[PDB]
Design an enzyme around this catalytic site. Structure first.
Site, PDB file in Angstrom:
ATOM      1  N   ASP A  35       0.855  -1.201   0.000  1.00 45.12           N
ATOM      2  CA  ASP A  35       0.000   0.000   0.000  1.00 45.12           C
ATOM      3  C   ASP A  35       0.885   1.243   0.000  1.00 45.12           C
ATOM      4  O   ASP A  35       1.295   1.676   1.087  1.00 45.12           O
ATOM      5  CB  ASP A  35      -0.877  -0.031   1.243  1.00 45.12           C
ATOM      6  N   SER A 199      -0.092  15.592 -12.086  1.00 44.39           N
ATOM      7  CA  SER A 199      -0.289  15.224 -13.481  1.00 44.39           C
ATOM      8  C   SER A 199      -0.481  16.484 -14.311  1.00 44.39           C
ATOM      9  O   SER A 199      -1.053  17.491 -13.809  1.00 44.39           O
ATOM     10  CB  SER A 199      -1.512  14.300 -13.596  1.00 44.39           C
TER      11      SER A 199
END
Ligand SMILES: C[C@@H](NCCn1cccn1)c1ccc(F)cc1
Length: 330
Positions: A35, A199
């Site tokens: 994770d 992004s």
């Protein structure tokens, strides 16, 4: 040192991936959910409330010659999805894919929430976010990666998740056979303890690329891609009959649909998520409504590049003095 371990989807939808991990002496092998959005290595154990265990493999510290109680230490964690666990702490030897750490904090669950009990395939989590998020009190503990970095050939690990197939976690090296083209690296902020990056934009299907900054985290422990409502609406507007269902808890679409791809930017590079990756199947067994793999982040507080996005790429988690992310197509 290096390590290399295969990670396997737990079910036909790729809802999570499990990776075998050796704990203790002699080894006890548990299948953990790696994770990158959390920082605790915790396991089902001989201490876990018996009614909360249903099929998991447990760690039994009393059978490990190398286990030692980390006296006074406790932990308690809750995830984005409302699941939780808590307990006490041992140190022990932990190996992943042939890479061994001695003295790793192994957080033994005394209690787990229903969502963990109900998933018999996941024996615990191995956190790979920054150690500043570790929940052990009163002495915060280091992640497996943070402890291994003192030994790795290169201070990196890579995630290569499969679409309805196994993939790989590598530690200490970048497998240049595992991706196509070049790796594009992008800056990371560690301010919130996550692999947080920006992004450069997105496109829907064959549409024009929209240049826009989208902060978010690279989170292998989240199934889906959670993005701003504007972006998500633009995607699902291209699927006839798609709608956000208040009764189901996100966008659903007709199971007869063909989904468009979704592209996200990494610097000047582009990662394309095929449309089929965005199909999470019927909302309930036999239904003709299907659940979408791209959902709004608006009720979270962060955008999350979960498995839907990450399994379209070869992803480098660079834990160098100034951490960075790399993405390559594959
Ligand atoms: C309890 C659990 N589910 C495993 C993932 N899953 C999605 C649908 C079904 N299973 C969990 C919760 C949070 C987390 F960070 C990791 C693991």
């Amino acid at each position: 040192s290096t390590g290399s371990a295969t990670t396997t989807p737990i079910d036909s939808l790729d809802d999570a991936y499990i990776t075998p991990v050796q704990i203790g002496t002699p080894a006890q092998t548990l299948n953990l959910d790696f994770d990158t959005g959390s920082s605790d290595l915790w396991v089902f154990s001989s201490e876990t409330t018996a009614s909360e265990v249903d099929g998991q493999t447990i760690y039994t510290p009393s059978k490990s010659t190398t286990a030692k109680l980390l006296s006074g230490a406790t932990w308690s964690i809750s995830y984005g999805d409302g699941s939780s666990s808590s307990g006490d702490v041992y140190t022990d030897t932990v190996s992943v894919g042939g890479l061994t750490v001695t003295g790793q904090a192994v957080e033994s669950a005394k209690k787990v929430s229903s969502s963990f009990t109900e998933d018999s395939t996941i024996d615990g989590l191995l956190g790979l976010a920054f150690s500043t998020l570790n929940t052990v009190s009163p002495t915060q503990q280091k992640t497996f990666f943070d402890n291994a970095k003192a030994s790795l050939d290169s201070p990196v690990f890579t995630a290569d998740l499969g679409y309805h197939a196994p993939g790989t976690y590598n530690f200490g090296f970048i497998d240049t056979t595992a991706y196509t083209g070049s790796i594009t690296y992008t800056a990371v902020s560690t301010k919130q303890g996550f692999w947080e990056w920006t992004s450069t934009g997105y496109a829907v299907g064959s549409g024009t690329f929209k240049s826009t900054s989208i902060d978010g985290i690279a989170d292998t422990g989240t199934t889906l891609l959670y993005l701003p409502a504007t972006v998500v609406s633009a995607y699902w507007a291209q699927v006839s009959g798609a709608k956000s269902s208040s009764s189901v808890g996100g966008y659903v679409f007709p199971c007869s649909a063909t989904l468009p791809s979704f592209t996200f930017g990494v610097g000047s590079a582009r990662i394309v998520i095929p449309g089929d990756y965005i199909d999470f199947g019927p909302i309930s067994t036999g239904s003709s409504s299907c659940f979408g793999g791209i959902q709004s982040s608006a009720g979270i507080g962060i955008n999350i590049f979960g498995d839907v996005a990450l399994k379209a790429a070869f992803v480098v988690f660079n834990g160098a003095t100034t951490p960075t992310l790399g993405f390559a197509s594959k």
